[PDB]
Swiss-Prot record:
Pfam families, alphabetized: Ribosomal_S5, Ribosomal_S5_C
Gene Ontology BP, a term: translation
Lineage: Bacteria, Pseudomonadati, Pseudomonadota, Gammaproteobacteria, Enterobacterales
Record's miscellaneous remark: Altered uS5 proteins have been identified in a number of mutants. Some mutations in uS5 have been shown to increase translational error frequencies.
Name by which UniProt lists this protein: Small ribosomal subunit protein uS5
Domain-level remarks: The N-terminal domain interacts with the head of the 30S subunit; the C-terminal domain interacts with the body and contacts protein uS4. The interaction surface between uS4 and uS5 is involved in control of translational fidelity.
NCBIfam families named in the record: rpsE_bact
Length: 155
RNA sequence: AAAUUGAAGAGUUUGAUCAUGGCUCAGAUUGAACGCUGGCGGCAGGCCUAACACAUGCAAGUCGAACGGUAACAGGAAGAA
């Protein structure tokens, strides 16, 4: 039932006496379709070993986001290295309109209706990093009520 | 009752990387042209250039119920046949 998505595969290279050593990298996300998302990143000489190492990482290192009927609480900004990220809770019917890197994160997360956009570097590893943290710092109508010490209508 | 209730990214500097930064692509749009091709219809559009120059026709007339009027054609008439 966990949902897992392959976001990007890439070839890097290391240089030695004999020449270049080629390897691969894999960036993935797993999610429970109901408010939990992890991302993983693995390296290996062959692609399958890399796509597999990443899922393994993605399964742990997983976090919770305070969803709201399949959509977000409030607009949110996320940032990590080059990537400035922005997300909005859209009305019902829209679905996920977003770049590939973000769509995969939001899909597996369970965010059903959102407007998203990535600014600056669309480098996938940092875009997803920035989205996860955005969702993670995203606070909930109940916690702000708890924080402020009042269960007014706003609860 | 309804009536802006909406927003995607990709390639390319490096051995590889992240950042910076330009170039390039996917989209809509057009009073278009050219190349290949071309059956019918409805609705629209059609000198963007030389406010360059223009043969010919046509594009501003109408009223005899303002007026003297008859030259055309149309009848009518004492009177010519
Ligand atoms: Mg940039
Ligand atoms: Mg090279
Ligand atoms: Mg022809
Ligand atoms: Mg016509
Ligand atoms: Mg003309």
């Amino acid at each position: 039932e966990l949902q897992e998505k392959l976001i990007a595969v890439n070839r890097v290279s290391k240089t030695v006496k004999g020449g270049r050593i080629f390897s691969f990298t894999a960036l993935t996300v797993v999610g429970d379709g109901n408010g939990r998302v992890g991302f993983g990143y693995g390296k290996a000489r062959e692609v399958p070993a890399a796509i597999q190492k990443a899922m393994e990482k993605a399964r742990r290192n997983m976090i919770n986001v305070a969803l709201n009927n399949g959509t977000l609480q409030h607009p949110v900004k996320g940032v990590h290295t080059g990537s400035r990220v922005f997300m909005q809770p859209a009305s019902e019917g829209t679905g996920i309109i977003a770049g590939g890197a973000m769509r995969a994160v939001l899909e597996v997360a369970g965010v059903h209706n959102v407007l998203a956009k990535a600014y600056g570097s669309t480098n996938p590893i940092n875009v997803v990093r920035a989205t996860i943290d955005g969702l993670e710092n995203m606070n909930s109508p109940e916690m702000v009520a708890a924080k402020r010490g009042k269960s007014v209508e706003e609860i």
